[PDB]
Amino acid sequence: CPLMVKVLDAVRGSPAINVAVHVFRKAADDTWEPFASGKTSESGELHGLTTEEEFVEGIYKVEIDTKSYWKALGISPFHEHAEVVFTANDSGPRRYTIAALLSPYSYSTTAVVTN
Amino acid sequence: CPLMVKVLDAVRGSPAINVAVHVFRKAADDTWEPFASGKTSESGELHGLTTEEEFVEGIYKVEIDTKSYWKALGISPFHEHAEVVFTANDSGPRRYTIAALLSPYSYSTTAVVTN
Amino acid sequence: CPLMVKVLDAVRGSPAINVAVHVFRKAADDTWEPFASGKTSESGELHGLTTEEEFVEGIYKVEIDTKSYWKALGISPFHEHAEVVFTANDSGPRRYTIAALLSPYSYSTTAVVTN
Amino acid sequence: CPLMVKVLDAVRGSPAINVAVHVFRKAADDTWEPFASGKTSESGELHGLTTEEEFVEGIYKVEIDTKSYWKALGISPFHEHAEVVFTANDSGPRRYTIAALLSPYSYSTTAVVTN
């Protein structure tokens, strides 16, 4: 998959399961166009968001619904979401893994980019 | 000072100096209204963004211009910016520090909320 | 595998390849006994450190040779290693993934523990 | 103050208060000699560990007692402690801040080295 998202829970030491993820692409008019969406699996992974064909060059935003995740576990967290904004495919097709590590008042995000 | 931002550079082991920071408040129509901005100091800090009176409950977004930071150091970055989105809640402690730790392909952010 | 180690490089956005890892186990005399060792692969993974049989209860230390990694890439980093110390298998056998995200002046480590 | 330690709690969004911290210096025989210790303050900080005169070049280990911290909050932790091992180098900046961000199954540490 050219775009994969992995989410971990730093309180439980577990994959973050059933986390909603929305991907947008910046349009020529500077608005955010919906691009793809999905939910993390039992492994905390979300595959199959897009295809080589559809994932063209652009500025992408990956919005991870961390507040819905924490509220479903009965926790009141700080952030509304984790937002990951990046230019993709500027020098040709690449494969992107966007990882997020979640705590109720903190998160980390890392990109692994492969050719 | 209800709202302060601290930025650290994980590659050099230093405060992240002269980083542009923009704070937005979400409007009733779901747009982002500019609210406050500035540049981190020699200590990596940005104070004086707002006042108790101005900083009402609401959804806020803090955009840290990480890409320009890494460009000025001659280092190739992944993200356009770091985005921190949160609801201000008067029920909790009154002083918010939004910390960010920057690497070229990764960042973390933490909210330190104190009285 | 009951014990796996994954290492990422937050400067390159890549797996951290050929990273030496040493695992120790605390002996009844309080010294650190060598337990297993290995090197991360092209994927940044290290499997096959141990077996269900050998990985009994105890206090384990996973030492990741981050300074050798950075020096091989021509970089002078801050830490000597990343050290991950934990009690394992206290309530029966579990599978542990120890992840580390490396920058020259910073690192993160996460444990994913599965039954 | 050549050596200062700052600890943050990612679950509560707060300084990590009353955390025990032990600093060791590596001896010629490869053992760890106690060097300095204390408990983080209400701000999560530990100042006054050493002096310019005492803090000579050498390999140091900072052990942060994360397990006792999480136990006192009634939260189940993974790590025994957080370990930060580094060489002090007079060629670089003179003030070292060792920051740590704590979650139950994850931590990060960063060195902020300034003049």
Side-chain angles (χ1 to χ4, degrees), chain A residues 1-5 7-11 13-16 19-25 27-29 31-32 34-38 40-41 43-51 55-70 72-74 77-82 84-89 92-94 96-115, chain B residues 1-3 5 7-25 27-29 31-32 34-38 40-41 43-46 48-51 54-62 64-70 72-88 90-93 96-114, chain C residues 1-5 7-11 13-16 19-25 27-29 31-32 34-38 40-41 43-51 55-70 72-74 77-82 84-89 92-94 96-115, chain D residues 1-3 5 7-25 27-29 31-32 34-38 40-41 43-46 48-51 54-62 64-70 72-88 90-93 96-114:
Chain A
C1 272
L3 175 64
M4 314 164 163
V5 177
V7 190
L8 292 183
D9 177 328
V11 171
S14 71
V19 173
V21 178
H22 295 250
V23 184
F24 307 86
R25 183 181 176 279
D29 66 9
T31 55
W32 289 110
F35 181 80
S37 59
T40 58
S41 71
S43 68
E45 294 180 53
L46 168 55
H47 299 279
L49 282 167
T50 194
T51 58
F55 193 38
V56 293
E57 287 191 78
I59 297 176
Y60 292 77
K61 173 172 54 166
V62 176
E63 166 195 294
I64 306 174
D65 296 334
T66 65
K67 184 179 199 176
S68 305
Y69 172 75
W70 291 116
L73 299 184
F78 182 75
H79 301 90
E80 286 299 301
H81 32 255
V84 177
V85 184
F86 60 100
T87 299
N89 306 310
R94 297 291 183 273
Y96 297 82
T97 299
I98 303 305
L101 173 73
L102 308 186
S103 303
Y105 284 68
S106 181
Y107 63 90
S108 191
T109 186
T110 306
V112 174
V113 181
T114 67
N115 199 336
Chain B
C1 219
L3 179 68
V5 176
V7 189
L8 295 185
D9 172 338
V11 170
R12 307 207 303 153
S14 68
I17 302 171
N18 286 328
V19 179
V21 177
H22 296 257
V23 184
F24 307 89
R25 186 174 186 274
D29 63 5
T31 60
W32 287 109
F35 180 78
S37 53
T40 62
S41 72
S43 71
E45 297 182 52
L46 175 55
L49 284 169
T50 190
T51 60
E54 187 179 39
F55 191 52
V56 295
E57 284 183 322
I59 302 175
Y60 291 84
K61 174 170 61 163
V62 180
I64 304 171
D65 187 3
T66 63
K67 192 177 184 183
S68 298
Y69 177 77
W70 292 123
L73 291 182
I75 290 163
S76 180
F78 176 70
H79 300 93
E80 289 295 297
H81 52 263
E83 196 161 296
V84 180
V85 180
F86 67 93
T87 297
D90 293 353
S91 319
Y96 297 76
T97 297
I98 304 302
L101 175 64
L102 306 185
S103 304
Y105 280 68
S106 179
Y107 65 82
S108 76
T109 184
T110 306
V112 184
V113 185
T114 57
Chain C
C1 272
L3 175 64
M4 314 164 163
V5 177
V7 190
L8 292 183
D9 177 328
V11 171
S14 71
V19 173
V21 178
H22 295 250
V23 184
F24 307 86
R25 183 181 176 279
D29 66 9
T31 55
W32 289 110
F35 181 80
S37 59
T40 58
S41 71
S43 68
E45 294 180 53
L46 168 55
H47 299 279
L49 282 167
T50 194
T51 58
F55 193 38
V56 293
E57 287 191 78
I59 297 176
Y60 292 77
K61 173 172 54 166
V62 176
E63 166 195 294
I64 306 174
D65 296 334
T66 65
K67 184 179 199 176
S68 305
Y69 172 75
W70 291 116
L73 299 184
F78 182 75
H79 301 90
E80 286 299 301
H81 32 255
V84 177
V85 184
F86 60 100
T87 299
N89 306 310
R94 297 291 183 273
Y96 297 82
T97 299
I98 303 305
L101 173 73
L102 308 186
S103 303
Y105 284 68
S106 181
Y107 63 90
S108 191
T109 186
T110 306
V112 174
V113 181
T114 67
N115 199 336
Chain D
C1 219
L3 179 68
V5 176
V7 189
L8 295 185
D9 172 338
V11 170
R12 307 207 303 153
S14 68
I17 302 171
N18 286 328
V19 179
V21 177
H22 296 257
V23 184
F24 307 89
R25 186 174 186 274
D29 63 5
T31 60
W32 287 109
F35 180 78
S37 53
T40 62
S41 72
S43 71
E45 297 182 52
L46 175 55
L49 284 169
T50 190
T51 60
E54 187 179 39
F55 191 52
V56 295
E57 284 183 322
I59 302 175
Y60 291 84
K61 174 170 61 163
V62 180
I64 304 171
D65 187 3
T66 63
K67 192 177 184 183
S68 298
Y69 177 77
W70 292 123
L73 291 182
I75 290 163
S76 180
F78 176 70
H79 300 93
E80 289 295 297
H81 52 263
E83 196 161 296
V84 180
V85 180
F86 67 93
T87 297
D90 293 353
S91 319
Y96 297 76
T97 297
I98 304 302
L101 175 64
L102 306 185
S103 304
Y105 280 68
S106 179
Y107 65 82
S108 76
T109 184
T110 306
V112 184
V113 185
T114 57

